[PDB]
Every structure is written in structure tokens, then in C-alpha cells.
Amino acid sequence: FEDIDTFEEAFNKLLREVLEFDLQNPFKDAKKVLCIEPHPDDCVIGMGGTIKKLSDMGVEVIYVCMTDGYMGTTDESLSGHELAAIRRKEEEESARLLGVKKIYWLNYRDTELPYSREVRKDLTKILRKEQPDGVFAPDPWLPYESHPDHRRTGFLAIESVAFSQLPNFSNTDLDIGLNPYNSGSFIALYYTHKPNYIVDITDLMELKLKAIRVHRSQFPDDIWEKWEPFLRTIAMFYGEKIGVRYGEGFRIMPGLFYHITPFTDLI
Amino acid sequence: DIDTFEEAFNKLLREVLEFDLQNPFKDAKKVLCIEPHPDDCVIGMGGTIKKLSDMGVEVIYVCMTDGYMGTTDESLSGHELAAIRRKEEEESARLLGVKKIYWLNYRDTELPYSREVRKDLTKILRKEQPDGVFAPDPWLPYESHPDHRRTGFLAIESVAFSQLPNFSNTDLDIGLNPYNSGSFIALYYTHKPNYIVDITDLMELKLKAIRVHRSQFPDDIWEKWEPFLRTIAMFYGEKIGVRYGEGFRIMPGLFYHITPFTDLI
Amino acid sequence: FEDIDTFEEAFNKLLREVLEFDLQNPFKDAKKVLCIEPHPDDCVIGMGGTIKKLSDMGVEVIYVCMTDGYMGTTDESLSGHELAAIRRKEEEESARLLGVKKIYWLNYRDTELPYSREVRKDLTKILRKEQPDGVFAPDPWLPYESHPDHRRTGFLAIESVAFSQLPNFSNTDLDIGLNPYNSGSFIALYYTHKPNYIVDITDLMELKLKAIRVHRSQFPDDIWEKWEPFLRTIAMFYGEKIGVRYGEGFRIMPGLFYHITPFTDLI
Numbered sequence: 001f002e003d004i005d006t007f008e009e010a011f012n013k014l015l016r017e018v019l020e021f022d023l024q025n026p027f028k029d030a031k032k033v034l035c036i037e038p039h040p041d042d043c044v045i046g047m048g049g050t051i052k053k054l055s056d057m058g059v060e061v062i063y064v065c066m067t068d069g070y071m072g073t074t075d076e077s078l079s080g081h082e083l084a085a086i087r088r089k090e091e092e093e094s095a096r097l098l099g100v101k102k103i104y105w106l107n108y109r110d111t112e113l114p115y116s117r118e119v120r121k122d123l124t125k126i127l128r129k130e131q132p133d134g135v136f137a138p139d140p141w142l143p144y145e146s147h148p149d150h151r152r153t154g155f156l157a158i159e160s161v162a163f164s165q166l167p168n169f170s171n172t173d174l175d176i177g178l179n180p181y182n183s184g185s186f187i188a189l190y191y192t193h194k195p196n197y198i199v200d201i202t203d204l205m206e207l208k209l210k211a212i213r214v215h216r217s218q219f220p221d222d223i224w225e226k227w228e229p230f231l232r233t234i235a236m237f238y239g240e241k242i243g244v245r246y247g248e249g250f251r252i253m254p255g256l257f258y259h260i261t262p263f264t265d266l267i
Numbered sequence: 268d269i270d271t272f273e274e275a276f277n278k279l280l281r282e283v284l285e286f287d288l289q290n291p292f293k294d295a296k297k298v299l300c301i302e303p304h305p306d307d308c309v310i311g312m313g314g315t316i317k318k319l320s321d322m323g324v325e326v327i328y329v330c331m332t333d334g335y336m337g338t339t340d341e342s343l344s345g346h347e348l349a350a351i352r353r354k355e356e357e358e359s360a361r362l363l364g365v366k367k368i369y370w371l372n373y374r375d376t377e378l379p380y381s382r383e384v385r386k387d388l389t390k391i392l393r394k395e396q397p398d399g400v401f402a403p404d405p406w407l408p409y410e411s412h413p414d415h416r417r418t419g420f421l422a423i424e425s426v427a428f429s430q431l432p433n434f435s436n437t438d439l440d441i442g443l444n445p446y447n448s449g450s451f452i453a454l455y456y457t458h459k460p461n462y463i464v465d466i467t468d469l470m471e472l473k474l475k476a477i478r479v480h481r482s483q484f485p486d487d488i489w490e491k492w493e494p495f496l497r498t499i500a501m502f503y504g505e506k507i508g509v510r511y512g513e514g515f516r517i518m519p520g521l522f523y524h525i526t527p528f529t530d531l532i
Numbered sequence: 533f534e535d536i537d538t539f540e541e542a543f544n545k546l547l548r549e550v551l552e553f554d555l556q557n558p559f560k561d562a563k564k565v566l567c568i569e570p571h572p573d574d575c576v577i578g579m580g581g582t583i584k585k586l587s588d589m590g591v592e593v594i595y596v597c598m599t600d601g602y603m604g605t606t607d608e609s610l611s612g613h614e615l616a617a618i619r620r621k622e623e624e625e626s627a628r629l630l631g632v633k634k635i636y637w638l639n640y641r642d643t644e645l646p647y648s649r650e651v652r653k654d655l656t657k658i659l660r661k662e663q664p665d666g667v668f669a670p671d672p673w674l675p676y677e678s679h680p681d682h683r684r685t686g687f688l689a690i691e692s693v694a695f696s697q698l699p700n701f702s703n704t705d706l707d708i709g710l711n712p713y714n715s716g717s718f719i720a721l722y723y724t725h726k727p728n729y730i731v732d733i734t735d736l737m738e739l740k741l742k743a744i745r746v747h748r749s750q751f752p753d754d755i756w757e758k759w760e761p762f763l764r765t766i767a768m769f770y771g772e773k774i775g776v777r778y779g780e781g782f783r784i785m786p787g788l789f790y791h792i793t794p795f796t797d798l799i
């Protein structure tokens with residue numbers, strides 16, 4: 001498009017006409033979504049209110065849990081194996097409150113999620129099988145995010161969504177009858193410091209906190225005394241951006257902006 | 268000695284470090300342009316490569332990976348794609364006056380982040396002793412390609428470590444010297460350029476040399492990439508009041524370590 | 533909390549009342565700290581004046597040096613092995629100047645510090661043995677920090693402070709008689725672009741510079757011509773933030789803010 005005079009015009013038209021980027025109803029046509037969490041409890045903590053709205057709308061929400069949450073206890077009589085078995089049941093109960101009926105467990109060990117082609121292949125197999133319309137994952141660019149399983153889950157989610165569409169990537173999936181990932185309409189990153197789309201969850205907030213507290217091994221009373229205010233305050237930070245009390249924030253960009261794009265901060 | 272941080276900083280830059288962004292590529296005779304995939308050098312700095320070649324600077328590509336994954340055409344294997352892209356790059360490079368291409372042959376999507384890859388880059392630095400090195404900026408936000416982030420880090424690392432005789436010492440044992448000798452790094456594909464090359468004049472040649480990578484840029488893909496690539500170029504060019512530009516981040520060598528005020532340049 | 537009106541009010545109550553955070557005197561109660569450095573000389577460069585002030589207050593300061601500094605010369609007649617043995621001696625003399633009596637050498641090769649569970653277990657064994665009240669380490673989010681041993685030390689130090697409190701993490705430590713890390717009261721990150729606590733080192737600058745120069749393999753006169761003004765300029769950058777001539781900066785945050793937090797820039 002050789003005749004536009006200003007960057008600001010080129011940018012507006014690139015987004016609205018060339019890429020048809022829309023932040024007004026980005027989940028509009030979604031029939032099936034995957035919600036990718038590093039640990040058991042992260043989908044509900046990051047976006048439980050939105051999962052419920054999606055389910056209320058008849059969207060099929062499927063979790064993919066990267067790790068088993070093996071390490072998340074300070075109880076010296078509770079082994080990692082026993083804790084992982086308990087957290088699987090806690091996630092099932094939590095997910096059921098939010099209308100989720102399927103969880104893919106990848107079973108990597110908590111604190112030890114690899115950053116590797118292998119983990120991309122696991123995600124790629126699920127994407128190719130399920131062909132979701134949209135995928136949710138943490139923002140790996142969150143500053144001061146000190147948990148490796150978080151940063152890696154975000155990177156590996158975005159990478160797999162792109163690479164799962166290439167037939168020479170993990171080519172054995174196609175040899176067993178799966179198609180390339182054909183169907184996706186969006187990625188939405190939660191746990192983000194740069195949200196550009198907010199779901200009002202004011203009405204849903206008590207359901208969210210309830211479904212979070214179902215992860216009892218994680219949230220005994222003394223930890224909840226700190227975590228409840230922390231989670232309320234995060235929801236208010238997001239809410240305020242659309243003038244509501246409580247929200248969940250997502251960063252959504254056109255697919256090209258995830259590569260070589262020097263003006264990602266303009267959205 | 269001096270009164271304020273401001274004075275300290277200005278002095279440090281101008282007199283102690285002699286940092287000049289008016290003409291950073293002034294004395295360059297040989298440069299390495301390090302790209303993650305075949306086409307990255309032409310997309311990110313093709314116009315600048317042309318300008319450099321036209322002024323008699325020798326431009327040498329180092330391409331980290333083989334572009335094996337880059338197709339959705341199920342009739343084309345990665346081996347065949349790789350072979351096609353080597354030829355696409357050779358033709359695209361010829362258009363820009365480019366000489367010589369080192370192919371490292373790591374598989375696309377699988378470039379390792381490791382001492383091994385730093386030794387490969389180091390061997391080339393010590394052999395070629397370039398005046399300057401260009402690479403993607405690994406700090407680019409929302410850069411989701413690991414081949415890009417890893418290439419950026421590894422280049423900066425290798426420019427540093429190839430200067431050290433205990434690093435990859437078998438190089439010296441076979442008769443290579445440590446890398447002098449470069450006077451700069453410049454990062455392209457950067458959100459924080461502080462040097463902009465006007466390429467308004469060369470934009471058409473740039474687009475032609477990009478399209479030479481035909482496996483990457485069929486018509487339906489070009490419908491989106493041409494507006495994107497033009498908008499990028501307008502983004503950079505607007506910063507210096509020209510139509511189409513190419514942006515680079517250049518900093519003094521000290522600033523890539525322990526420096527809390529890098530955003531001041 | 534469900535009754536707080538605005539995000540701005542919730543954030544303030546969270547920070548001050550729930551998390552009890554303030555930066556009036558963060559190092560106040562400390563009897564023992566670990567100063568974790570990527571290379572020999574990094575503690576003194578990043579925080580030497582502070583180390584001396586901690587030793588002057590009777591705090592036991594202990595270094596953990598991740599790597600051997602094997603690569604850090606341009607002298608073609610000096611092997612890395614010889615350099616490593618030299619730099620150990622340099623660090624010992626540097627450390628004695630600042631009142632430090634104990635250094636754990638992990639002995640990873642310089643330029644080759646792994647980013648792995650193994651290195652977290654090394655740091656966890658020392659945390660569990662020492663039970664320090666605080667830990668200092670480089671900020672791994674420093675922009676344009678190009679040295680992988682720096683970013684890796686920072687991330688591993690933060691992770692280790694957290695995972696070492698978990699008894700299923702590196703569980704053989706417990707089996708041989710070490711307790712989980714508790715005692716911990718803070719992490720302070722030095723080499724930071726986002727300091728929120730400044731230590732005035734104006735009258736200690738000359739001692740800090742002498743203690744840096746004791747690392748002679750690193751700072752012969754021709755290198756010092758550049759590094760002395762560089763190091764002065766950094767110290768002025770931090771000092772200016774509290775209206776003094778030379779400072780050392782640290783970033784300190786509540787434990788919760790190192791995870792899933794989208795407003796860490798408000799502190």
C-alpha cells in the first residue's frame with residue numbers, strides 16, 4: 001500500500017483493514033478454546049471468571065495443565081506424589097464449578113517444566129487433535145515473573161500455536177492422521193502487565209474465589225489471609241481499565257505482531 | 268571530581284567512551300550480518316546492506332538456521348525447502364551486492380542456546396575479523412521466535428567472548444587469533460533504535476529482494492506482508508522525518524553489562 | 533477488602549497492611565546475609581559499600597560465587613586454570629577489606645553457568661545450611677544485560693530462595709539433616725535499572741574502589757581508565773535518587789510480587 005502519507009495512517013489501516021484486528025468481541029465466534037496453565041489452579045486464578053462466561057455461552061473450554069504441582073506444599077509429611085494426586089482432584093472439582101469437563105495433564109514435574117522441542121510437540125499434538133478456535137496462556141513477558149514454569153508455559157504456548165500449523169513440524173502427527181493446526185482465531189495472554197482486552201468479572205468474583213479455594217492444599221486460611229486481598233487487588237487493577245470493580249485482563253495482538261514488530265506497545 | 272550524574276553521564280559517553288551516533292558505520296570495510304533464518308538480513312536491513320555494498324564495504328551473511336520449517340505446503344519436505352531457500356538467499360543476496368554466506372545449518376525452530384553455537388560464531392569472528400556485526404535485538408518485546416531471541420543473545424555474547432583467548436581455545440591452537448578488531452555491534456529488528464538509515468530510495472529494491480524468497484512470500488501471504496513491511500519501514504523512517512527507514516540500536520560496549528541507564532541512549 | 537472502593541486504595545492497603553511492606557530500613561533485623569555473585573568481584577562492584585556497612589553493623593556477610601572467572605583475561609600466556617586460582621586469591625583479599633569471612637565457591641566455569649535444577653540444588657543446600665535472613669543477587673530483568681552468567685545467577689537466586697522452603701524440593705537435603713529454608717526475610721537485587729532502595733556510600737567510595745582494584749587480573753591501568761569513570765557514573769546515578777553523591781541501588785519487593793503480579797512497577 002504505497003500511497004499512505006503517515007505512519008499513524010499506515011498503522012490504523014494495517015490493524016483495521018489488512019489484519020482485521022478487533023478488540024471489541026475477540027472471543028465472538030469461538031466454539032472450543034484451550035486454556036493452558038503452568039500449574040493446577042492457574043487457569044482459575046488467571047481467568048476463572050472468563051472461563052465461566054465462555055462455558056455459560058456454550059463454548060467448550062479444555063484445560064492443558066503443564067505440570068503436576070508436585071512441589072507446592074510446606075507440609076513435610078506430604079510427599080510430592082501424594083500432593084500431585086490431591087491437586088488433580090482439586091483441579092477436577094474447580095474445573096467442574098466453571099463448566100470445564102476435559103483436562104489434558106502433561107505431567108511434567110512442578111519446577112522442572114523443560115523449555116524444549118519435546119514440550120512443543122506435546123502441545124502441538126493437542127492443538128492438532130482439538131483444533132481449538134482460541135488458546136489462552138500466561139504472558140511470558142510479565143516483568144518480575146520469577147517462576148520458570150510460567151515464563152516457559154507462555155513461550156511454549158505461543159510457539160506451539162505457530163509451529164503446529166507447519167506440516168514438517170512434528171511430522172509424525174500427520175503420519176498418524178492428524179491435520180496441521182488449521183482453525184485458530186486467536187491467542188489471549190492472561191497474567192499480563194499490558195492487557196488490551198478486559199472481561200468484567202465483578203458479578204463472578206465470589207465464584208472465582210470459591211473455585212480458587214477448592215485448591216485447598218494451596219490455600220489454607222493463613223495463606224488465604226494474604227492471597228484473597230492480593231487476588232482482589234489484581235482484579236481491581238484490571239477492572240478499573242474498563243470502569244468496573246473486578247476484571248480479568250488479556251493481551252491480544254494480530255499474529256504478525258508476535259514477530260519482528262517494533263510497535264507492539266501501540267496496542 | 269564532577270558535580271552531577273548528568274555531567275558524569277555526558278562526559279562518560281562523549282570523552283571516556285567516544286560514542287558517536289552521527290556516523291557509526293563510517294570506517295567499516297567488512298561487516299557480518301547475522302540472521303536467524305534465510306531472508307532476515309534482507310527484511311531487517313536489506314536497504315542498509317545495499318548502501319554498504321555500494322560504498323565498497325564487504326557484507327558477509329552468517330545464517331544460523333536452514334529455514335526447514337517455513338512452509339505450509341504439505342508436498343514440500345523440510346529438506347527440499349531448505350535446499351530451495353539456500354538458492355533464494357543466494358539470489359536475494361546477489362541483488363544487494365552480498366558476497367559470501369556462512370551457513371551454520373542448525374534446524375529452523377531448533378537453534379540451540381549453547382556454548383557450541385557460540386563456538387561456531389566465534390570461529391567465524393576470529394577468521395573474518397569484521398569491523399562490525401549486525402544481529403537481531405534479543406530484547407525485542409513480544410518476539411516469540413526462539414531462533415530470533417537466541418541469535419541476538421548468542422551474537423552479542425560471541426562478539427565478547429571471541430576476544431578471550433581461553434574461550435574456545437582450540438581455535439588459537441589451529442592458528443586463529445582472538446577477535447579484535449570489530450568497532451561495533453548494531454542491532455536490527457529493534458523497538459529502541461537510536462540510528463535510522465533512510466531507505467526511501469531503495470525501498471523498491473528491498474521489496475523485490477525480499478520477494479526473491481518466493482517460498483516464504485507467495486501472493487496471498489504478500490497481501491499482508493507488504494503492508495506490514497511498509498508500515499514497519501514508515502515507523503522507523505518517521506523518527507528521522509523520511510518516508511521509509513531501517514532502525515538500528517547501537518550502544519557503547521560497556522553498556523551491554525551491569526548498566527542501569529541504558530534507556531538514556 | 534471486598535468493601536474497598538478503588539484499585540488505588542486496595543493497592544495501598546495490600547502493600548502496607550496485608551504484606552507489611554516498607555523500605556524505611558529493610559535490612560534492619562539481619563544477623564546473616566548471603567551475597568550471591570556471578571563472578572569474582574561482582575559483590576564488591578555491585579554492593580561493596582553496602583557489604584562494609586552490613587559488616588560494621590555486626591551482620592555476618594557470606595559470599596556465594598557461582599563461577600570461577602576462568603575466562604576473564606586477554607593474556608594469551610595465562611590459562612583459565614591459572615586465572616581461576618589467581619582470582620580466588622583476589623576475592624579473598626577483596627572480601628577481608630569488607631569484613632567477609634566466608635565464601636562458598638560453586639566452581640561452575642565462567643561463561644558456562646548452567647540454568648538447571650542442579651544449580652538450584654547447590655544454592656538450596658547452602659540456604660538450608662546457613663539459614664540467612666537475607667539474600668542479595670543481580671536483578672535478572674536488567675535490560676541489555678548481555679552476560680548469561682548474570683541473568684542466570686539472578687533467576688536461580690530468586691528461584692532457590694523460594695523452592696528451598698519446599699520440603700519436596702531437593703528432598704535428600706532433609707534426609708541428611710538440613711531443614712527447609714525458613715528464616716528468610718528478604719531478597720534484595722543489585723545491578724538494577726529499577727532501584728527502590730538506595731544505600732548512601734559517599735564516604736565509602738574510596739574504600740569500595742580500592743576493594744575493586746584488588747582484583748588486579750581484571751582492572752590493570754588501561755581498563756581502569758574506562759571502568760573508574762563508569763563505576764563512578766553508576767554510583768552517581770543511584771545516589772542522585774536520594775540526593776546524595778554516591779549510592780548503591782537495590783530492588784526489593786514483597787515475596788508475592790515476584791509472581792503473577794501486573795503492577796510491580798508501582799514500587
Ligand SMILES: CP(=O)(O)N[C@@H]1[C@@H](O)[C@H](O)[C@@H](CO)O[C@H]1O
Binds near residue numbers: 038039040791
Ligand atoms: C498460583 P501458582 O503459580 O499455581 N503457585 C505455584 C504452585 O502451583 C507450585 O506448586 C509452586 C512450586 O513450583 O509455586 C507456586 O508459585
Ligand SMILES: CP(=O)(O)N[C@@H]1[C@@H](O)[C@H](O)[C@@H](CO)O[C@H]1O
Binds near residue numbers: 335375
Ligand atoms: C521473517 P523470518 O524470521 O525469516 N520468518 C520465519 C521463517 O523463516 C521460518 O522458516 C519459520 C518457522 O520457524 O518462521 C517464520 O517466522
Ligand SMILES: CP(=O)(O)N[C@@H]1[C@@H](O)[C@H](O)[C@@H](CO)O[C@H]1O
Binds near residue numbers: 572574
Ligand atoms: C564485572 P564482571 O561481570 O565480573 N566482568 C566479567 C568477568 O568476571 C568475566 O570473567 C568475563 C568473562 O565471562 O566477563 C566479564 O563481564
Ligand SMILES: [Zn+2]
Binds near residue numbers: 039042150
Ligand atoms: Zn502457576
Ligand SMILES: [Zn+2]
Binds near residue numbers: 570
Ligand atoms: Zn560478573
